[PDB]
Amino acid sequence: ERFYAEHLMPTLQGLLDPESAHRLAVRFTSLGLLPRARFQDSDMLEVRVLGHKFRNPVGIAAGFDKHGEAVDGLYKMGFGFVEIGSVTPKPQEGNPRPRVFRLPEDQAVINRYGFNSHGLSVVEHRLRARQQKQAKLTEDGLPLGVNLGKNKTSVDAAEDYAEGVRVLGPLADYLVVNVSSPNTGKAELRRLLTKVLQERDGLRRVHRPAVLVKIAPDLTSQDKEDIASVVKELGIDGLIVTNTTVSRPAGLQGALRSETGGLSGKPLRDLSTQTIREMYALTQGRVPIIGVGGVSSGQDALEKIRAGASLVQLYTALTFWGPPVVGKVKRELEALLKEQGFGGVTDAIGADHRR
Numbered sequence: 001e002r003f004y005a006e007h008l009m010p011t012l013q014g015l016l017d018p019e020s021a022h023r024l025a026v027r028f029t030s031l032g033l034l035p036r037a038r039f040q041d042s043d044m045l046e047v048r049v050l051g052h053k054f055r056n057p058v059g060i061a062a063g064f065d066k067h068g069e070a071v072d073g074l075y076k077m078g079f080g081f082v083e084i085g086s087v088t089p090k091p092q093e094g095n096p097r098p099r100v101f102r103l104p105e106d107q108a109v110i111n112r113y114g115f116n117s118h119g120l121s122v123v124e125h126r127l128r129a130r131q132q133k134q135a136k137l138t139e140d141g142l143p144l145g146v147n148l149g150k151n152k153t154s155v156d157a158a159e160d161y162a163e164g165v166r167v168l169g170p171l172a173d174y175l176v177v178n179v180s181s182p183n184t185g186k187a188e189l190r191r192l193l194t195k196v197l198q199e200r201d202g203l204r205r206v207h208r209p210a211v212l213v214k215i216a217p218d219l220t221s222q223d224k225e226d227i228a229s230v231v232k233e234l235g236i237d238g239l240i241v242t243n244t245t246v247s248r249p250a251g252l253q254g255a256l257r258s259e260t261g262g263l264s265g266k267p268l269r270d271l272s273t274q275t276i277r278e279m280y281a282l283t284q285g286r287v288p289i290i291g292v293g294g295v296s297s298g299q300d301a302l303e304k305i306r307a308g309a310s311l312v313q314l315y316t317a318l319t320f321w322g323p324p325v326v327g328k329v330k331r332e333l334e335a336l337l338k339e340q341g342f343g344g345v346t347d348a349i350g351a352d353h354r355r
C-alpha cells in the first residue's frame with residue numbers, strides 16, 4: 001500500500017506518459033501480473049441491487065478497460081464489479097495524442113480520449129470467450145457492466161446505443177448509456193431511452209441486463225430534474241453519478257489544468273457526491289445509484305453511499321495509488337460502517353437523507 005503509493009507508482013510515473021501508463025496497466029492487469037488481492041470481503045460489504053448480488057460495493061469505473069481486455073484481472077484486484085467501455089458500434093481511434101494528462105498536485109487527471117474503441121464486434125467476441133466464466137462470477141457476486149458509447153460520425157445516436165444493447169446486452173449484467181462524456185431536449189432523452197429500453201426488453205430473459213444512465217456533474221438543475229423525471233417515467237434501472245467534469249474547480253494547481261477534457265480524481269469528488277445527493281432526492285431514493293468521482297478512501301466511499309449510492313466506482317485513484325487502493329477503500333469502509341453504527345453497506349445507503 002505505502003510501497004505503491006510512495007515508491008512504486010511515483011517512480012513509474014516519471015518514465016511514462018499517462019496514456020502509455022494506461023496501456024501498460026491494462027496489459028499487466030489482463031495478464032494477472034498483480035498479487036491476488038488479500039482482503040477477503042466481509043458480509044457487511046455485500047449489496048443486493050440491480051437484480052444482482054455484489055460481494056463488495058467497490059467497482060472499477062468505465063474507461064480503464066475500454067475494450068474488455070482485463071476483466072478477470074480487475075476482479076483479481078478485488079473489485080466487486082467491473083464496468084468495461086465505453087464501447088462504440090464501429091471501431092474508432094478517438095482523439096489525437098496527447099489526450100490524457102496527469103495533474104499530480106491535484107490528484108487528478110484530465111482526459112480527452114474521445115471514445116477510442118475496438119468496437120462492438122471485437123468486444124462481443126472477447127466477452128463471448130469468457131461468457132460462462134462471467135456467468136459464474138456474476139452468480140458468485142461479481143457482476144459485469146458494459147458502458148455503451150456512440151461513434152463520432154453517427155447520424156442517429158439512439159441507433160448506436162440500440163446496436164450496443166443488441167450486441168453486448170446479452171453479455172452484460174448491466175448496460176450504461178452516458179447522457180455524459182465531455183469528449184464527443186427532455187423529449188429527446190425520453191425518445192432515446194425508450195428505444196434503449198425497448199431493445200433491452202426484446203432480449204431473452206437470461207440475457208436481459210439492467211439499464212443505467214450515466215450523467216455528468218455539469219448538468220443544470222433543470223437537466224437533473226428532467227433526467228430524474230424521465231428515469232422514473234420509463235423505469236430506468238439506475239443512474240451512474242458521475243462522469244468527469246468539464247468544469248475546472250477553483251484551486252487546481254497542475255500545470256495542465258487548462259487542457260481540454262474531463263477532469264477526474266479528487267477535485268471532482270464532492271461535486272459528484274452532491275450530484276448523487278440531488279439525484280437520490282429527485283428519484284425519492286427508489287432508483288439505484290452507482291456513485292463515482294474522486295473516491296480514494298473508505299470515507300470517500302461512505303460519503304457517496306450515505307448520499308444515496310448503493311455502489312461506488314473508482315478509477316483515477318487506482319492510477320495514482322495502484323491496486324492496493326482497492327483493499328484500502330474496502331477495509332476503511334468496513335471500519336467506518338462499524339464506527340457509525342451501520343450493520344452493513346445496505347443500512348447506510350441514503351442515510352444522510354433520513355437525518
Ligand SMILES: Cc1cc2c(cc1C)N(C[C@H](O)[C@H](O)[C@H](O)COP(=O)(O)O)c1[nH]c(=O)[nH]c(=O)c1N2
Pocket residue numbers: 061062063064066085086100109111113115147178181214242243244263264265266268292293294295313314315316317
Ligand atoms: C482516462 C479516463 C477515461 C475514461 C473515464 C475516466 C478517465 C479518467 N471515464 C470516467 C470514469 O468512468 C469516471 O466516471 C470518472 O473518471 C470519475 O471517477 P474517478 O474520479 O476517476 O474515480 C469514462 N467514463 C465512461 O463512461 N466511459 C469512458 O469511456 C470513460 N473513459
Ligand SMILES: O=C(CCNC(=O)c1ccc(OC(F)(F)F)cc1)N[C@@H]1CCCc2ccccc21
Pocket residue numbers: 009012013014016017018019020021022023024025026028064100101102109319320
Ligand atoms: O498517469 C496517471 C496518474 C499517475 N500514475 C502513473 O503515471 C502510472 C505510471 C505507471 C504505472 O504502472 C503501470 F504498470 F505502468 F501501469 C501506473 C501508473 N494516470 C493515467 C491516466 C489515466 C488512465 C491511466 C490508467 C492506468 C494507469 C495510469 C493512467
Ligand SMILES: O=C(O)c1cc(=O)[nH]c(=O)[nH]1
Pocket residue numbers: 063086111112113114115116178180181182183243244262
Ligand atoms: O473516451 C473519453 O474521452 C471519455 C469518455 C467518457 O465518458 N468520459 C471521459 O472522461 N472520457
Ligand SMILES: [Cl-]
Pocket residue numbers: 170171207
Ligand atoms: Cl448471447
Ligand SMILES: [Cl-]
Pocket residue numbers: 299302303336
Ligand atoms: Cl465518513
